[PDB]
Amino acid sequence: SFSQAVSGLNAAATNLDVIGNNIANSATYGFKSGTASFADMFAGSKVGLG
Amino acid sequence: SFSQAVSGLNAAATNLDVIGNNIANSATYGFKSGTASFADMFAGSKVGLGVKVAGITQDFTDGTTTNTGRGLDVAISQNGFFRLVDSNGSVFYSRNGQFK
Amino acid sequence: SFSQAVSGLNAAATNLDVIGNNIANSATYGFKSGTASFADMFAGSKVGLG
Amino acid sequence: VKVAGITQDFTDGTTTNTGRGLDVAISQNGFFRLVDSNGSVFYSRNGQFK
Amino acid sequence: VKVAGITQDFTDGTTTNTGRGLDVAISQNGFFRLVDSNGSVFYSRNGQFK
Amino acid sequence: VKVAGITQDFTDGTTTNTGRGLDVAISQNGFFRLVDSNGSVFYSRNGQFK
Amino acid sequence: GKLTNGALEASNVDLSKELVNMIVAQRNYQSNAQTIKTQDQILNTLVNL
Amino acid sequence: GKLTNGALEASNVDLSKELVNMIVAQRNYQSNAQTIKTQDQILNTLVNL
Amino acid sequence: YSNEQEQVLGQIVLANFANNEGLASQGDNVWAATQASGVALLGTAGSGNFGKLTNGALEASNVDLSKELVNMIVAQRNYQSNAQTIKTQDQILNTLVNL
Amino acid sequence: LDENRNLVNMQGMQLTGYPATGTPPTIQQGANPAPITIPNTLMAAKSTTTA
Structure with a gap:
């Protein structure tokens, strides 16, 4: 199905986005770095959903 | 008839999906890759009846201990x-x- | 009658079925490929039975 | 033959992300x-x- | 066409020095x-x- | 090809003084x-x- | 086992080994679907006979 | 179950599963056209006889 | 073990059969010895008529798709040939019965 | 493995093999095989007999 692929793809989109923001703010002063934290998803079945 | 195909066909689809999940989870920290293990079926005759998925087994071989500093x-x-x-x-x- | 043909027809289906299973069993780990073997028949007359 | 009933697979699907x-x-x-x-x-x- | 057979080549390759x-x-x-x-x-x- | 194994070269390195x-x-x-x-x-x- | 502080654990999923498997999985699914042709043709064949 | 603020539930339906069911339904339904046709043809023989 | 020793919790036992192709598959990927299939004829993994046990490896599917993708086609063409026979058989019987 | 700690495949079939007896344990060569198991027990302190 398309569900897991879409979820992974728009998760990697945010993963690139946070790196882009971190790079763009590599010169600000009161800045704390950012990182994404993911968590996979399962239904009642044994096969995952993204 | 169709039983020899569709059931096996299902297995193939399921396989791709779990593979996709691996690709969809190559960045999550507390994740373990999973692979499908199959098994055939037989009636009383000498002809097969397709394949049923037997189990989605993870691989618990430890990964790399990347640091963050927290x-x-x-x-x-x-x-x-x-x-x-x-x-x-x-x-x-x-x-x-x-x-x- | 149908005997000369229908049996072979059934045989043909089996020859296909044993292939289909092998197509389906192309991902299992302990499988062994399988084929079929056939044999003709002869009645009292010298004409084949199927 | 019959129709015992019409059932619904209640296995919950994926949880998408919309931000709303x-x-x-x-x-x-x-x-x-x-x-x-x-x-x-x-x-x-x-x-x-x- | 058959496969008349598989023929191995028996030319000597190079001689790497590993030190063991x-x-x-x-x-x-x-x-x-x-x-x-x-x-x-x-x-x-x-x-x-x- | 089957990976026969990963061997290790057990020769000694270069002795380096550190003063400890x-x-x-x-x-x-x-x-x-x-x-x-x-x-x-x-x-x-x-x-x-x- | 020991608990290492200030570190986490990776996903242990290698991409160089999964992309090659996905090609085989796709072509295997296509080959499985190829039987439905003969099978559907046979059925039509049995019916239109 | 649990909740999540900002999300939606999918349709839990798969096309790859469903099309092949539709094929066997197309083939299985036809395999019933043949029984009704051979069940009526025989009767057409009797009335003409 | 934690006492710089180790037990022997068992030894894997193989099974070599003089006759083959009599092993009736039993659903799951297991075979059963039947009549004339031969006795179990046990034996360890070391010597005689037995093979090595590679650790961490698994058997392949023993099928090459290129081979059956054409056997399927030729079997199909055989199937419509049969059907043409059986079509002819139905046809023949048809003309005679209506006559 | 299993909760009963047995060498079992994907369908509930115990793997069978030569058992081991004696102290120190050693396998047999003609015994009827019994299902292999991985007990979580403790070794006993066997005193010295020869040196």
Whole structure:
């Protein structure tokens, strides 16, 4: 199905986005770095959903 | 007839899906890759009847211990599991040490 | 009658079925490929039976 | 032959991401009790609200 | 068409120097003779010796 | 091709002085023997203690 | 096993080994689907006979 | 179950599963056209006889 | 073990059969010895008529798709040939019965 | 493995093999095989007899 692929793809989109923001703010002063934290998803079945 | 195909066909589809999940989870920290294991079926005759999926088995070989520098980030090196609980009271087990 | 043909027809289906299973069993780990073997028949007369 | 019944696979699907405020997800068994204007009561799973 | 057979090439390749002591390489015709477990006499040319 | 195995080259390195006291190197074959808190026995070659 | 502080654990999923498997999985699924042709043709064949 | 503020539930339906069911339904339904046709043809023989 | 020793919790036992192709598959990927299929004829993994046990490896599917993708086609063409026979058989019987 | 700690495949079939007896344990060569198991027990302190 398309569900897991879409979820992974728009998760990697945010993963690139946070790196882009971190790079763009590599010169600000009161800045704390950012990182994404993911968590996979399962239904009642044994096969995952993204 | 169709039984020899569609059932096996299903297996193939399922395989791709789990593969996709691996690709979709190559960045999650507390994740374990999973692979499908199949098994044939037979009637009383000498002809097959397709394939049923037997089990989605994970591979618990430990990964790389990448660091972050935060204090509340611990990682297991061998066999073991963090024991988590929920508000209701149920129990769970995990390996992601990214606490808070 | 149908005997000279229908049996072979059934045989043909089996020859296909044993292939289909092998197509389906192309991902299992302990499988062994399988084929079929046939044999003609002869009645009292010298005409084949199927 | 017959029709014993018409069933529905109640295995919950994927939880998408929309970012809106008035969107809610149900991770397991659980329903939303809604009322009609006249006072009737139905039960649904849609998370679209406003 | 059949497959008349598979023919191996018996030209001597290059001679890499690894520095270990328990390893050799044959320069011309000749094969190492080995016997495993029960019996049987196998022939080889690899020089990596445990 | 089957990966027969990953071998290790056990020649000695270059002896480098560091000026500390809790550090010893071996000039030829030999291994330091260490005990784990779990009682397991391990062997090593880096001489740098605490 | 020991608990290392200030570190986490990777996903142990290697991409160089999964992309090659996905090609085989796709072509295997296509080959499985190829039987439905003969099978559907046979059925049509049995019916239109 | 649990809740999540900002999300939606999918349709839990798969096309790859469903199309092949539709094929066997197309083939299985036809396999019933043949029984009714051979069940009526025989009767057409009797009335003409 | 934690006492720098190790037990022997068992040894894997193989099974070599003089006759083959009599092993009746039993659903799951297991075979059963039947009549004339031969006795179990046990034996360890070391010597005799037995093979090595590679650790961490698994058997392949023993099928090459290129081979059956054409056997399927030729078997199909055989199937419509049969059907043309059986079509002819139905046709023949048809003309005679209506006559 | 299993909760009963047995060498079992994907369908509930115990792997069978030669058992081991004696102290120190050693396998047999003609015994009827019994299902292999991985007990979580402790070794006993066997006193010295020869040196």
